[PDB]
Amino acid sequence: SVIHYLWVGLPTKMNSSASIAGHDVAGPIKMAKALQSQAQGKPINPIKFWCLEQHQDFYQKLFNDAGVTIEVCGIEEIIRQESLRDQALFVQKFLNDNLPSGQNSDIKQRVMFKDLFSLFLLVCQPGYFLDTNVFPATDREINLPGRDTVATAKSGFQKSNDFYLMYSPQRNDSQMSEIFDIWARNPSFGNLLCFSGSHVPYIEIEDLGVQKISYKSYWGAKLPGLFFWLERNNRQLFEENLPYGDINQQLACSFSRKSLAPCSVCYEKLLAMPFTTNEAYIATKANQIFYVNKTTKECVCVDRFHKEKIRLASESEINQLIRSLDNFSHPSYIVNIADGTLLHHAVLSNNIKQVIMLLELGAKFDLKASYQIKPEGTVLKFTPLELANYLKHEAIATLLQSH
Amino acid sequence: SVIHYLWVGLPTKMNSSASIAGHDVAGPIKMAKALQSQAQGKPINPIKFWCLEQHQDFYQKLFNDAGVTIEVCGIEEIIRQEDQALFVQKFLNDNLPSDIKQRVMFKDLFSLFLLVCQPGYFLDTNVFPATDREINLPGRDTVATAKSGFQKSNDFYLMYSPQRNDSQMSEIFDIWARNPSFGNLLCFSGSHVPYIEIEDLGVQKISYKSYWGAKLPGLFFWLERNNRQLFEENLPYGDINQQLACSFSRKSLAPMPFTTNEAVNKTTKECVLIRSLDNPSYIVNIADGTLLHHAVLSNNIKQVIMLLELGAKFDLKASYQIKPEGTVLKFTPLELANYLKHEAIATLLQSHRI
Ligand SMILES: O=c1ccn([C@@H]2O[C@H](COP(=O)(O)OP(=O)(O)O)[C@@H](O)[C@H]2O)c(=O)[nH]1
Ligand SMILES: O=c1ccn([C@@H]2O[C@H](COP(=O)(O)OP(=O)(O)O)[C@@H](O)[C@H]2O)c(=O)[nH]1
């Protein structure tokens, strides 16, 4: 009846550029808040939070300052104290050999440790283990009982077990311990074959009243902090996770793009078809694509992402014309290079509802951000109001009139 | 005769991020510097520098703060003084309230207009004096240009007109005036303009290709040339302490078969040199990088040594970002060197702070 939440790395507040806002505490806060919202009596599931100790006092303050009971534990703390089966030291061998310094080690080496430490943890202390991405189900009842075998949850994307939820009934059960050794023989990124060293039973995550969300935070790059939630556009979701970030955080938002002159999409050298823009990339009779600019004469020759082929030809236009796959001559587009904000991104995307949502929740409205004109080289420092005048977006009536 | 220099756009000093440092003034200054070099006497070819009138006071100060005599003239002043040059100002207003290519187009147009109004020579600010030779720019009798770098025909970078409103120069203008395009070299085919041997004048042209949308800004274009002479030569035309988001300043962190140090990934699983743009982690300057910072990143001890002597500040902060994992690190040049583990330059910057 124990719940092990685990976060490896710096707190999402202090790592606002490489972490998702509330990626370590939203679930545990929502869980503990929900765990003491069903059991009218005394029956409450102990919640443990394992982190590096440099953030024990910080994480411990977060959970009581949110009004929830979560005893924060340390990674090293339960290793200083060993355990008679003490020989677990393999964990620190991997721990020291990759990430003992300050700079955030490469993410994959942390997800590796999450795997290893999660398997290790249930060997020493029985109960459940959840990723912090495991919140409580909506309008359902949370039920985390205590069974008799080591069981995990269904590998949601495959047909096997998965780390996102596990359970062990006794300290060093001859089934949890054997799974650990298979990880130590070939430790690697998400090795799902340690469970294949036996026949691990399955737990239906839905039957517990909880649910898993996949943030996929290693597959390449992503949006940082609160930007990850602003893109989901559920104002409920943003308001929920806003406590775990800063509405005023400034970040280099390489995603914040916008084209200056709109160009078109079409259809073999004249190619001066009647598009209404000053330029377009058009698909030819066959072969591939071109780049045409009516103002000069260029007709550079540059299967996916842009395909106008039947009925309407020189008629379609903008969308995600980021065709900057042809890194040849192209139209001019604007990019945030430094100190952009949520409000800045909202102003660029011409999302008046988002500009209004942020301005109400307390966002400062005239902070400066650094923008560049890519190919050109023009670097401009803009307030959200100044960006809005430049981009010609009818949202200044909101920014340039107080209220 | 007369030498017509032309610059369309903002002064490279005030545009250190979209222009090359000394792309507008290095060539013309060295020209005047070379014309006065000998005991020639008093006769010296008059040099004109054509720019937008807003930067007349800036340029007039720049050439005077140097030891050169260059009469700066305004593009808009001569077009208002004119006779049917409304096409020039019509092109001026409908293009240049911008895009560099739109600019180079106006350079081509205004240069042809210039030789129609005022006879003499025209050179790009890229046209320097030749090395160890003597500059000899006489006054001939026909409209003649230099030879294009590629192929075998005429070119815009060096031209000549002998008389005001020559019946051949004016005609070349008209071929451009109603088929305007980027580098329309077919206006010269409307006759056979004689050819000028660039070596016989004592001047030489360099090509920066400033409109390839991928160049280096300000002094970074010269720091990459690795010629300590070339940077020190052009360093007056920039700022050794300028801060820029230098996205080109990138670095690596690394380098069933055997693949040694990856580049497949041994430490992890993996089921699937600079050219690395692929769907491997690296660091990139995202804000306020400097020449010294780039030198520190590139592990160019000579550049770190050359810059530190020429007066570069060594304790400015720059913003760097690990690519895959959003990580922002604020670094002094020394701190970048310790982080990147650069043996000699780290000790060199630590000892220059005390
Ligand atoms: O920097 C990180 C990233 C992930 N995790 C752990 O992994 C979970 C996040 O998993 P993610 O969504 O990134 O991957 P997926 O769940 O889609 O496999 C968190 O709740 C933590 O338990 C962590 O501790 N630190
Ligand atoms: O913004 C600009 C860029 C260029 N130029 C003029 O065009 C020349 C650029 O020549 P470049 O070497 O870049 O072109 P290339 O000759 O290599 O094609 C400069 O010297 C200037 O005379 C200009 O007036 N404004």
DSSP string, A304-335: -S----SS-STT---SS---TTS-SS---EEE
Q: Any chain A CB within 8 A of the CB of B310?
A: no
Quick one: chain B helix, strand, coil %, rounded to 5?
35, 15, 50
What is the CB neighbour count within 10 angstroms for residue A327?
Answer: 12
For A225, other C-beta atoms within 10 Å of its C-beta total: 26
Q: Token pair of A210, please?
A: 């909880």
DSSP one-letter string for B186-255: GGGGGTT--EE-GGGGTEEE----TTSS----BTHHHHTT--HHHHHHHGGGS-TT--B--TT-EE-S--
> Would you call A69 helix, strand, or coil by DSSP?
coil
DSSP B99-162: -HHHHHHHHHHHHHHHHHHS-EEEE-TTEEEPTTS-------SS-EEEE-SSSSSEEEEEEEES
Query: Strands B318-322 and B283-287: what pairing?
Result: antiparallel
Evaluate whether B85 touches B113 at the Cβ level (below 8 Å).
Answer: yes
Distance A49 CA to ligand 1 centre (A): 14
Are B154 and B120 contacting, i.e. CB atoms less than 8 angstroms apart? no
A298 by DSSP, 3-state: which? Answer: coil
Q: How far is CA B332 from CA B141, B349, B353, in A?
A: 60, 10, 12
Nearest to A5 by CA among A125, A92, A104, A95: A125
In a 10 Å sphere around its CB, with 0-12 CB exposed, 13-18 middle and 19+ buried, how is residue B94 labelled? exposed
Tokens of B140: 């001939």
Q: How far is CA B341 from CA B74, B314, B347, B351, in A?
A: 52, 17, 11, 16
Contact residues on chain B for A375, CB-CB shorter than 8 A:
213-214
Class of domain B3-205: alpha beta
Beta-strand pair B318-322/A47-51: unpaired
Q: How far is the CA of A324 from the centre of ligand 2 (A)?
A: 25
Helices and strands, number each (H, E), in chain B: 12, 13
From B14, B75, B107, give the residue whose CB has the most ligand 2 atoms within 8 Å, as the site to mutate.
Answer: B107
Elucidation method = X-ray
Closest CA to B176 of B106, B93, B95: B106
Interface contact A338-B245, CB threshold 8 A: yes
Spatial contact of A172 and A85, defined as CB atoms under 8 Å apart:
yes
What residues contact B278, with CB distance under 8 A and at least 6 apart? Answer: none
Pairing of strands B3-6, B120-123: parallel
Q: Whose CA is nearest to atom 9 of ligand 2?
A: B210
> Which ligand 1 atom sits nearest the alpha carbon of residue A216?
17
- The tokens describing A271, both together, are 């190619």
CA-derived radius of gyration, chain B: 24
- Nearest atom (ligand 1) to Cα of A118: 22
Exposed, middle or buried, B212 (CB in 10 Å: 0-12/13-18/19+)? exposed
For A22-68, the DSSP string reads TTTTHHHHHHHHHHTTT-SSS----EEEEE-GGGHHHHHHHHHHTT-
- The Cα B346–Cα B340 span in angstroms is 9
**Which amino acid is located at A42 in the chain?**
K
User: Residue A137 has what DSSP assignment?
Assistant: P
Tokens of B336: 């970048």
**B264 Cα–ligand 1 center, Å:** 23
- Angle at A116 (CA atoms; ends A114, A122), nearest 5 degrees: 95
Cα B160 from Cα B139, distance rounded (Å): 9
A102 contact partners, CB below 8 Å, separation of at least 6: none
Q: How near does any CA of chain B get to the CA of A329, in Å?
A: 8
- Exposure on the CB side of residue B195, measured as CA atoms within 13 A: 10
Residue B26 CA: distances (Å) to CA of B12, B13, B32, B34, B202 = 11, 12, 10, 12, 17
A375/B213 CB distance under 8 A: yes
Q: Which residue has the tokens 């005047």?
A: B32
CA-CA distance, A240 to A399, in Å (whole number)?
A: 25
What are the Cα distances from residue A285, in Å, to A149, A271, A282, A297, B265? 65, 11, 10, 20, 43
Are domains A3-230 and A247-257+332-399 of this chain identical in fold? no
Which residue type, as a one-letter code, is found at position A79?
A: I
SS3 A162: strand
* Ramachandran quadrant class, A293 (left: phi over 0; alpha: psi -120 to 50; beta: rest): beta
Q: Kindly report the backbone phi and psi dihedral angles of residue A327, in degrees, each rounded to the nearest multiple of 5, phi listed first.
A: -85, 65
Q: Is B19 helix (H, G, I), strand (E, B) or coil?
A: coil
Give B307: exposed, middle or buried? Use CB within 10 Å, 0-12, 13-18, 19+. buried
**Are the CB atoms for A375 and A333 separated by under 8 Å?**
no
What's phi and psi for B71, nearest 5 deg? -75, 115
User: Cα–Cα distance between A20 and A222 in angstroms, integer?
Assistant: 9
Q: Count of CB atoms within 10 A of residue A200's CB?
A: 19
Please check whether residue A197 is in contact with residue A176, taking contact to mean a CB–CB distance below 8 angstroms: no
Residues in Cβ contact with A103 at an 8 Å cutoff, skipping those fewer than 6 apart? B327, B329, B339
* Interface touch B15/A104, C-beta < 8 Å: no
- In the block, tokens 């497949």 appear at B264
d(CA A334, CA A326): 17
The Cα–Cα gap between B137 and B120 comes to 10
The token pair that represents A116 in the structure block: 């290893």
Whole-angstrom Cα distance, residue B13 to residue B24? 9
Residue A160, CA atoms < 13 Å, CB-side half-sphere: 13
The first and second tokens of residue B44, run together, are 């010296």
Q: Is A64 exposed, middle or buried (0-12, 13-18, 19+ CB in 10 A)?
A: exposed
Q: Are strands A333-338 and A257-259 parallel, antiparallel or unpaired?
A: antiparallel
With a 6 Å cutoff on the Cβ, whether B5 touches ligand 2 is no
Domain ranges of chain A: 3-230, 247-257+332-399, 261-329
Q: How far apart are CA B343 and CA B293, in angstroms?
A: 15
Q: Is B340 annotated as a binding residue?
A: no
Task: Yes or no: say if B16 and B234 are a contact pair by the CB < 8 Å rule.
Answer: no
Ligand nearest to the CA of B221: 2
Burial B263-284 (b: 16+ CB within 10 A, else e): eebeebeeeeeeeeeeeeeebb
Residue environment code for B26-41, b if the CB has 16+ CB neighbours within 10 A, otherwise e: bbbbbbbebbeeeeee
For chain B positions 223-282, those within 8 Å of chain A (CB to CB) are 244-245, 247, 267-269, 279, 281
Q: How far is A129 from chain B (nearest CA, A)?
A: 23
Atom of ligand 2 nearest to the CA of B27: 20
What span, in angstroms and rounded, lies between the C-alpha atoms of B246 and A338?
A: 12
Q: What topology does CATH give the domain A3-230?
A: Spore Coat Polysaccharide Biosynthesis Protein SpsA; Chain A (3.90.550)
Any idea which ligand is nearest the CA of B103? Answer: 2
Q: Whose CA is nearest to atom 25 of ligand 2?
A: B8
Q: Which chain B residues have a beta carbon less than 8 Å from that of A376?
A: 18, 99-100, 213
Cα–Cα distance for residue pair A230/A227, rounded to 1 Å: 5
Helix (H) or strand (E) holding A135: strand A134-136
- Across the interface, whether the CB atoms of A370 and B245 are under 8 A apart is answered yes
Q: How far is CA B243 from CA A342, B240, B297, in A?
A: 25, 9, 15
Angle between helices B56-65 and B26-35 (to 10 degrees): 50
B71-74/B120-123 β-pairing:
unpaired
Q: What's the fold here for domain A247-257+332-399?
A: 1.25.40
Per DSSP, which regions of A328-387 are E strands?
A: 333-338, 369-372, 379-382
**CB B317, CB B330: distance < 8 Å:** yes
Per CB-CB distance under 8 Å, the chain B contacts of A296 are: 101-102, 105, 181-182
Q: How many residues does chain A have?
A: 403
Per the document, the length of chain B is 354
Of A13, A32, A31, nearest in space to A23 by CA: A13
Residue A116 Cα to chain centre, angstroms: 22
Q: Residue A83 and residue B282: Cα distance in Å, rounded? A: 40
Chain breaks in chain B (C to N over 2.5 A) after: 82, 97, 255, 263, 272, 279
> Which helix (H) or strand (E) segment is A358 a member of?
helix A352-361
What are residue A306's phi and psi, to 5 degrees?
A: -160, 110
- Residues of chain A found within 8 Å of residue B184, distances taken between Cβ atoms: 297
Q: Which amino acid is at B274?
A: I
Task: Please name which of B334, B335, B331 lies closest in space to residue B320, comparing C-alpha atoms.
Answer: B331
Nearest CA-CA partner of B128 in B155, B154, B157: B157
Amino acid symbol at A155: S
Homologous superfamily assigned to B240-272+280-351: Ankyrin repeat-containing domain (1.25.40.20)
Residues 115 through 174 of chain B touching chain A, CB cutoff 8 Å: none
Looking at residue A225, what DSSP letter applies?
B
**B195 within 8 A of B154, measured Cβ to Cβ:** yes
Q: Which of A7, A39, A45 is nearest to A26 (CA)?
A: A7
Residue B106: count other Cβ atoms within 10 Å of its Cβ. Answer: 22
Q: A86 vs chain B: nearest CA distance in angstroms?
A: 27
Secondary structure class of B168 (helix, strand, coil):
coil
A212 labelled binding-site residue? yes
Structure tokens at B203: 């001047």
Residue (of B128, B122, B85, B86) closest to B107 by Cα position: B122
CB distance B17 to B244 below 8 Å: yes
